[PDB]
Ligand binder design. Structure first.
Ligand SMILES: *C1=[C@](*)(*)[C@](*)(*)=[C@](*)(*)[C@@]2(*)=C1(*)C(*)(*)(=O)O(*)C2(*)(*)C1(*)(*)=C([O])N(C2=NC3=C(Cl)C(Cl)=[C][C]=C3[N]2)N=C1[C]
Ligand SMILES: *O=[C@]1(*)O(*)C(*)(*)(C2(*)=C([C])[N]N(C3=NC4=C(Cl)C(Cl)=[C][C]=C4[N]3)C2=O)C2(*)(*)(*)=[C@](*)(*)[C@](*)(*)=[C]C(*)=C12(*)(*)*
Ligand SMILES: [Zn+2]
Ligand SMILES: [Zn+2]
Lengths: 340, 303
């Protein structure tokens, strides 16, 4: 049972350690691009969220890197687009070079951003492909996202989200909410909107994830929260590949998995509910919660609970039924897709 | 038999205005603001009308110590020679340099300190041993925070200060992140500290005339308390229902430190706060005998 899941986790771990050289090459290109973006008046304030130089969206693709370059906005003014809760318009300004009226243009900023990188990479066989920019290094992928940074308090749409109060405590929720939030240019299908991003909060939670501060720092306190998440992400990625030729799994992403996972951490706040010896049942409970979300068509954003990731306006019912059928098959046959 | 200690805590439970706002100092050059951003501190639990405020100044340094481990020389900036204000505030104190300009008909002891965002000095490498208590990740995080330099005589020196870390630990003090946020998880760590501070303050007043207790401070009490928290890392060893024994164990640890002449700095372990060089054994023995008398007699000093 769990021995099979553990074998999967061991090969997933080994596959992601052998990236030393690649990681170096990414750091090199990133340092180059940030130094050069800074030569422009608009981008002098660019920088890495944390001096973490990279992340991986797909657990099964260690050669595919993801980085975010952030840019601080001194006094940002947000205005909600069409009642979406997650999509906003952004309103002596080093970005006045891109204001189309009182609105900051996602199209203008990205065009300049893409030009500097294209030019800077024309100076290691690196090619640009049109996540603002995707770079192909040698024949290593690097996705670069541009985000605005705001140190103002979080938008009211997040007021009832991040319900980690019975898990990570009320004190942590307050401290987390004093941190900046980010905006990424993103078409609200309108093209000039920006989407809220709390990716940096999710990272701090996953790496400081127990009620006990010493959770996973000793043998007595080993939990399987991170193992369960990894197994859920790998499940989706493998199914997305088998049917990459079909349209049914195109709208599903690792964001859906993480959101469902955080919701189960809220439901199961005690470390004793995530004991490593119970990897099998904990995983099965995470799969079951995710399936319940697919059948009832409900997956609330962890930070914005009024935004339903699984509504019929985003993903049709047939796609959710197809995914449900595939995961249920895998669950009843001890996940053969893991071995494929 | 802890019902008396609870009565004391209720008494200690039963309109700050800072002037600190003056802004006026910002109208100068060298001056730079409050360390307790948005928060007013009470060095003495028994003195609600005695306030302690700290002003901080950022300094992007070349510290040099002798082997004091705590006293250093601070080697476009808005003095020199090795770096060395009261007159500034004198327009709008013998304890070394801090506090200074104590000031309100209510005292506001103001300390001015330098802020460094450089790594902590090597002398602190083996201190802050909260790893089995608050965890390794909290130790690492806390050590990425700034440290402060307070003017204090060791010629002219500056002394390290970690009072802002002690604050963050005291207000986030359990193994569980939800320690004291629900009925199931109420501990008595803060109450034990308050009772230890009150005991020292009440005895420092009884023997105000004598010189035996002149060198003892709330700092000694807090340092001993933190060591007790390190020795007893689990929330279950601090259960609120056991206030009586937890307090008694804190008093005992402090007494062991006095008898053995050994109280290490929590941040700088090689700095002995209770060495014979700083405090005479007869002062430590005098305090020991007064504390033991108080423990044997249900703390009359609290009455
Ligand atoms: C000034 C104003 C308010 C309280 C105090 C002072 C002061 O200097 O005495 C206390 C005080 C104090 O002595 N300390 C110490 N910090 C410290 C360190 Cl970091 C080392 Cl390594 C050795 C000795 C001490 N004493 N902190 C305060 C608040
Ligand atoms: O805007 C962006 O969306 C996110 C993003 C998350 C979060 N997850 N994905 C994602 N998962 C995934 C899988 Cl499991 C497979 Cl098999 C294939 C492709 C994806 N994508 C996201 O795209 C994101 C991440 C980086 C940059 C921009 C975004
Ligand atoms: Zn854990
Ligand atoms: Zn507590």
């Amino acid at each position: 049972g769990a021995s099979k899941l553990r074998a999967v986790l061991e090969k997933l771990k080994l596959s992601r350690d052998d990236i030393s050289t690649a990681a170096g090459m990414v750091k090199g290109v990133v340092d180059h691009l940030l130094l050069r973006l800074k030569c422009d008046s608009a981008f002098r304030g660019v920088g890495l969220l944390n001096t973490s130089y990279y992340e991986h969206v797909k657990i099964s693709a260690p050669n595919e890197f993801d980085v975010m370059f952030k840019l601080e906005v001194p006094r940002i003014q947000l205005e909600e687009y069409s009642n979406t809760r997650a999509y906003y318009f952004v309103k002596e300004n080093p970005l006045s070079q891109f204001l189309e009226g009182e609105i900051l243009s996602a199209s203008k900023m990205l065009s300049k951003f893409r030009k500097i990188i294209k030019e800077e990479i024309n100076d290691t066989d690196v090619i640009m492909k049109r996540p603002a920019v995707t770079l192909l290094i040698s024949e290593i992928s690097v996705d670069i996202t541009l985000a605005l940074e705001s140190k103002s308090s979080w938008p009211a749409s997040t007021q009832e989200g991040l319900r980690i109060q019975n898990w990570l405590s009320a004190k942590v929720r307050k401290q987390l909410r004093l941190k900046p939030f980010y905006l990424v240019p993103k078409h609200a299908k309108q093209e000039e909107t920006w989407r809220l991003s709390f990716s940096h909060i999710e990272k701090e939670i996953l790496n400081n994830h127990g009620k006990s501060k010493t959770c996973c720092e000793n043998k007595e306190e080993k939990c399987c929260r991170k193992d369960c998440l990894k197994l859920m992400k790998y499940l989706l990625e493998q199914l997305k590949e088998r049917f990459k030729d079909k349209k049914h799994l195109d709208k599903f992403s690792s964001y859906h998995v993480k959101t469902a996972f955080f919701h189960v951490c809220t439901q199961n706040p005690q470390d004793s509910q995530w004991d490593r010896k119970d990897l099998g049942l904990c995983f099965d409970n995470c799969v079951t919660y995710f399936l319940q979300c697919l059948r009832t068509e409900k997956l609330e954003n962890y930070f914005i609970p009024e935004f339903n990731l699984f509504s019929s306006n985003l993903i049709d019912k047939r796609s959710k039924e197809f995914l449900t059928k595939q995961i249920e098959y895998e669950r009843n046959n001890e996940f053969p897709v893991f071995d494929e």
